[PDB]
Enzyme design. Structure first.
Site, mmCIF file in Angstrom:
data_model
loop_
_atom_site.group_PDB
_atom_site.id
_atom_site.type_symbol
_atom_site.label_atom_id
_atom_site.label_comp_id
_atom_site.label_asym_id
_atom_site.label_seq_id
_atom_site.Cartn_x
_atom_site.Cartn_y
_atom_site.Cartn_z
ATOM 1 N N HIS A 172 0.822 -1.209 0.000
ATOM 2 C CA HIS A 172 0.000 0.000 0.000
ATOM 3 C C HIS A 172 0.857 1.260 0.000
ATOM 4 O O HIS A 172 0.500 2.258 -0.635
ATOM 5 C CB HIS A 172 -0.951 -0.001 1.196
ATOM 6 C CG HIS A 172 -1.733 1.269 1.349
ATOM 7 N ND1 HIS A 172 -2.851 1.552 0.594
ATOM 8 C CD2 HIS A 172 -1.554 2.330 2.171
ATOM 9 C CE1 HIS A 172 -3.327 2.733 0.946
ATOM 10 N NE2 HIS A 172 -2.559 3.225 1.901
ATOM 11 N N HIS A 210 1.061 5.336 -2.402
ATOM 12 C CA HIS A 210 1.477 6.661 -1.949
ATOM 13 C C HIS A 210 2.697 7.199 -2.689
ATOM 14 O O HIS A 210 2.685 8.348 -3.142
ATOM 15 C CB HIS A 210 1.746 6.645 -0.439
ATOM 16 C CG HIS A 210 0.505 6.595 0.396
ATOM 17 N ND1 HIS A 210 -0.293 7.699 0.609
ATOM 18 C CD2 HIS A 210 -0.072 5.577 1.076
ATOM 19 C CE1 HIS A 210 -1.310 7.361 1.382
ATOM 20 N NE2 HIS A 210 -1.199 6.078 1.680
ATOM 21 N N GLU A 218 -6.458 9.159 0.428
ATOM 22 C CA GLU A 218 -6.606 7.718 0.593
ATOM 23 C C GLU A 218 -7.535 7.100 -0.449
ATOM 24 O O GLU A 218 -7.183 6.100 -1.082
ATOM 25 C CB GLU A 218 -7.103 7.399 2.008
ATOM 26 C CG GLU A 218 -6.959 5.939 2.412
ATOM 27 C CD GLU A 218 -5.518 5.536 2.665
ATOM 28 O OE1 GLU A 218 -4.672 6.433 2.865
ATOM 29 O OE2 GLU A 218 -5.234 4.320 2.671
ATOM 30 N N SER A 264 -3.797 0.519 -4.764
ATOM 31 C CA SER A 264 -3.234 -0.695 -4.187
ATOM 32 C C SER A 264 -4.268 -1.799 -4.000
ATOM 33 O O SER A 264 -3.986 -2.790 -3.318
ATOM 34 C CB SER A 264 -2.540 -0.380 -2.861
ATOM 35 O OG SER A 264 -3.480 0.049 -1.891
HETATM 36 FE FE LIG Z 1 -2.168 5.051 3.286
#
Ligand SMILES: [Fe+3]
Ligand SMILES: [Fe+3]
Ligand SMILES: [Fe+3]
Ligand SMILES: [Fe+3]
Ligand SMILES: [Mg+2]
Lengths: 422, 428, 424, 426
Positions: B263, B268, B308, B327
């Site tokens: 993730h 990110h 997010e 992700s």
């Molecule tokens: Fe995160």
């Protein structure tokens, strides 16, 4: 004069500055056009542009051994790809721009290109050996490492104590407000005392906590290009040795006393830091004729400058704040005083050996910064430069789209101040 | 219903911090440093630096805790009354008439970087594996002993772990071209070429952190587990992204009740390499500094629907930029289908939207761009009750606490500098 | 040393003006107009206009004189206390707790535009004195908004103009600044600047209005420094219509039509110079006499006898230089002493009107000189700041908060304009 | 049937050349000789110094179709042999030309008399021969009006004052609760100093003088409806083309056409506010030289802002559209929960369909006049024009800025103003 023309190493420095719009296959086609010419992948980094959100910047680390095939690649880059390519060379070949570092780490590469039978310490083999010890510390220093600490002898500390005592008793009445404003902090947090020589690592950390400036150990005198270029990153090339003990008052070389007592306090002030940084950004890629002018301007500003303070005049030049004799001299009725005007200042003759008969008075550090920027506009360069403190890399503005993103970021900050007054 | 907001705790000693400035005057500096030193507050806890705006003032950075609390009232009383200095009091336990503590320098992130919300849950898909539990405790010890400025320790991953990374990498990469936003697809090839982002290799946090520093100045920080919303968001103000080093259990490569290395690196890292997104997330961090817990909640909800699980407008189409989407192969396909409900991003409504971490989001908020989202965040931040304003200084890596007058001065001088740059650059 | 500073007088009735604003509230406007009406100050002397910045305020323009002085204290007392309005009191006699009067609108220039020898080279000529009183009567009867009366000049006067025009023009190319030589051919082409023709003030004022918005105003003689400099704030240049005596075409210890048209008009047609001189005018509004003096000296060494930097050389832009063949050659020799323009230092420089200036101040540029004037103007003791509004042709009186608001919103507008114009 | 009126052309039309020239020995004479040698006399070509490039000259050319035979040659010499960026303005809008617009405030005179002539036989005054005669009186006042002249004063009859009184009384009794704050802020001043009363019809000269003392706006008598291009272009100079006649007495509450009540009660109060003046002027600057497709969009944007706009006032909503402030019926309608409300977004607003005849089912709400002005400026960037425009209130002339050197002076004026604000902060 205080000018030292830059040399060139065995291999020199070659750098290509160009951007590329993202397009299917473009990145692979560029990396293959370099790799097929025996320029391995380790020499070409590709990072996203900091303004054109759809472009890539390429930083090339090359030398003269690539020069036979460089023109072919440049010919393909400019014509077959349609990209404006700037060529940076340290040997200053025809149709090239004088090289300058693109990242703060690239200062390492030529930071060791230094440059005695009359020095007052030539007959002392212990002093010569110590100078070679400090020189080896700098020769082995790389950006990012802590500055090695060196215990000084009591004789060296006596010389430092004499210089510290005589100058400190004179800063209150002869130094500028900013010097006297920061000096108590250096005494309290950096060990600036009569019985102690500070450690360059501790001083560099204090500068980083004030204005982001950082010290870099250097063995001897670097070229004007290299030193001024280092100022663009707020990196002050600093010597670690101390003058010989026999003459603790006369010195034609910058020792730890000149660097710490003359330079460090002002380098800790935001206005002065921005001023010296503005000089550094002005030097990046300038012709030797303008490397001259900036070096002379630096000699009459950062080195032997005077600034206005109410109705009186105080000294801010490091050559004044580290020389008891001339610091007293510069405020008497003997010197000749002129207002700072960089078009005339940049052409003013001066001699390093004797006391300066003529000083240039600055309105303020902020006004001197603006004058430097104005002077920098007149410097012949095929682009403009702006420093990015996040990545510690210099960005080269020249495209129109880059001016749009910069102008729209200005317009946003203006609207922030409009909504702020309420 | 569960959320993502994590209320912050307090260590054994907590955090106390004083933010104040002092006008230079004969003996004033020595008189202040003496009143601290005489109360057994040694010089290592009181730094004094020149103010960046008022060329005649000094800023003081105080590193204190409850061990000083018996003498705090006396010292503050003399500063305000006998010395005449405006004193802000930062406390982590948030007593009344105090400001919720936040780090002032990038180094102070070390202090509470280990306050995790501890044997992992018996419902985790790795509870039965004693090797996995032990390995998670290896990564946890790497983070517990990590301090700012150090290189991130490199860890050789096992062959099964690299197979799990390969399964997640291959399935997602085959979908980024048509489902990810432009910025993700813009930087992702660079991560594959310069950071070793490959199906058969798990990147090292040190190499990735160095790459982020070369793109937008962002930097990775190994963290053992989930930090409080205040601490994590506050870390974003310095462009510091608290990042996990472990990987999902091999059995269930498509489920992760926690955020692992998959993730963090795939969701990110690409966007953190983009200037617009870096400035956007940084603005969220600056908004969090010193906010009340109620507004730490709202910012956490805004982060959940932006950084997010956010969607952004790209011409006439819509692409995904949320890390939770980039992700998750399953929800990445879902979020662009005709099933979800899409609303335009408006932070006053977004900050109050209910959401569930376990299931797919029924409603996503679409942003115009990272620049427009940044402008919305700052405007929202203006409504946050705070007795001052905040701004990040990338030169010293320290947060500047400013009032209304000082905020006008930096804005005016930052405009003056950038306009002078535009003037010189126009002729070139 | 006989300076160019002329202290201001006062008429019989003088001028009184109240500057104050009022928040809108049921009956508040009528209650203010009533307290004036009940004191025999009829509504025609009290204008009420909406404030440009505070959407909830009203501006009041009061046209009063000494006949109101018995009742001024009562009205001011109620305005400040019972109504809660910050009231500035403008008086031309400069009583204590008053601000030196200045016109608030371009029309109020009329009020003191008329507040005006044995050695003059025309004292023995009764015909010349009579003609000077003719031009003076032309100006005495001139009011703002009217076209400037055209006057046929004699053939002797046109010969004097030709002598002065010919000798100066043959010297402008090598001695005048770039701006003078840039606009002068346009004045020759559209305003009749010729050796055989004296231009008409109406045609020149219309030309200036089409260049920088400046406009000429016929004046009988020398006005006070306060009134004249204050006139520059509105881009109104009080200009003489007569011509020097024919006997000595190269003399005149005073400014004739040649000095006004050849020395001032070209530079007033340049935008940068227009903004510079206007900034001096805005600086004068309400300044103490000590600073009216300093501004007069600053004007004497800039607009009147100034030198400017032009590449590596130095050129003259002072009207007193561009209209004096003798001193125009003198000012570029190695004889004078040259100093950089510093208004704190410039404002204290000694000078003599009769003799050649021993010392000239060199300016970097008209744009840089504008910034110096405003900065110096900030040091002038005044309870507010002033900014000119060319839409309404009225001066804006603002505090520190309001000045930061207009500066921020003017920048915000000009930046957005630069943003849109860059993408083209 | 929208509020858009496509611009026509007169019999000679309008041709204009926009170009600048750097000063160099003989260059000015070479341009004046290149016009004169082609029988283009000096009386149509004035030469003035550029306001930004201190070393350049601006040329204002007043030409028509009779000059067209030699225009191409001159442009070719101007562009190639002289090296000047030349914009070609034509009123008939030929290809590779810019739609003509006035360069000075005086040039508004030239086509101010181009009417959209007897009255529509559906007007509520067709059967009244006195009313038909009165409309031709006001129309002839406008036909003979030129910029700079005072507006001729006309004594109105008692019937006309009755119609004014009915419209005045019913609307004013509703402004306090339905009009925006700015309207109610200036309206008492118009009543006290401009004779806005139930028993008096104001004079356009007194109102124009009041507008000049407030925001510099000025009224211009017009006989009838002008094209969208001409009217919007007049707003760039803060010149509001204004009608002098009044609606027919039989139906004082109905009007297809805009009478004196719509102009004085709907427009004049807001035109006295700086923020609104700058807003409408920004619409005017956006229109200068825009393609007819964008003249459409600006006309629609004007219909939903200046004409039938709503603005936010705290948590409530008030009306500021002149079409609302002059229509008692729809003024009550526009603030109920019956209409459909959307947020102002000019990319969507400029394409929104509407009907002039019936009440608008949809209104666009603006955040404020400053926010609406900024939205207009942003939209104006999207308008296809080979340059940008900026108004100069000192010379009352529009400055066009295309080159980089003019962006430098604009950037330096910004840099100076910023340093001004910096010094004023301390
Ligand atoms: Fe995160
Ligand atoms: Fe040095
Ligand atoms: Fe004069
Ligand atoms: Fe209308
Ligand atoms: Mg292995």
């Amino acid at each position: 004069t205080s000018y030292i023309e830059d040399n060139s190493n065995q291999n020199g420095a070659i750098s290509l500055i160009f951007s590329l719009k993202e397009e299917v296959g473009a990145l692979a086609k560029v990396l293959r056009l370099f790799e097929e010419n025996d320029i391995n992948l380790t020499h070409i980094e590709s990072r996203p542009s900091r303004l054109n959100k759809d472009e890539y910047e390429f930083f090339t680390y090359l030398d003269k051994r690539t020069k036979p095939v460089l023109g072919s690649i440049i010919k393909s880059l400019r014509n077959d790809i349609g990209a404006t390519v700037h060529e940076l060379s340290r040997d200053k070949e025809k149709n090239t721009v004088p090289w300058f570092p693109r990242t703060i780490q690239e200062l390492d590469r030529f930071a060791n290109q230094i440059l005695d039978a009359d020095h007052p310490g030539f007959k002392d083999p212990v002093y010569r050996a110590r100078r070679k010890q400090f020189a080896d510390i700098a020769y082995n220093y790389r950006h990012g490492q802590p500055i090695p600490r060196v215990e000084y002898t009591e004789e060296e500390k006596q010389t430092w104590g004499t210089v510290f005592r005589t100058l400190k008793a004179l800063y209150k009445t002869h130094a500028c407000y900013e010097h006297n404003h920061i000096f108590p902090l250096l005494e309290k947090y950096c060990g600036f005392r009569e019985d102690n020589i500070p450690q360059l690592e501790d001083v560099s950390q204090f500068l980083q906590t004030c204005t982001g400036f950082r010290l870099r150990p250097v063995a001897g005198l670097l070229s004007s290009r290299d030193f001024l270029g280092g100022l663009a990153f707020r990196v002050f090339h600093c010597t670690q040795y101390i003058r010989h003990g026999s003459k603790p008052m006369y010195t034609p070389e910058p020792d730890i006393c000149h660097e710490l007592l003359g330079h460090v306090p002002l380098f800790s002030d935001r206005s002065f830091a921005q001023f010296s940084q503005e000089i550094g950004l002005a030097s990046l890629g300038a012709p030797d004729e303008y490397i001259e002018k900036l070096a002379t301007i630096y000699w009459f500003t950062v080195e032997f400058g005077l600034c206005k303070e109410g109705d009186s005049i105080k000294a801010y030049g490091a050559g004044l704040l580290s020389s008891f004799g001339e610091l007293q001299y510069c405020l008497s009725d003997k010197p000749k005083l002129l207002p700072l005007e960089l078009e005339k200042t940049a052409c003013q003759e001066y001699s390093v050996t004797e006391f300066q008969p003529l000083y240039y008075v600055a309105e303020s550090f902020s006004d001197a910064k603006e004058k430097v920027r104005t002077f920098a506009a007149t410097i012949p360069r095929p682009f403009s430069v702006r420093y990015d403190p996040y990545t510690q890399r210099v960005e080269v503005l020249d495209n129109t789209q880059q001016l749009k993103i910069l102008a729209d970021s200005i317009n946003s900050e203006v609207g922030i101040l409009c909504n702020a007054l309420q």
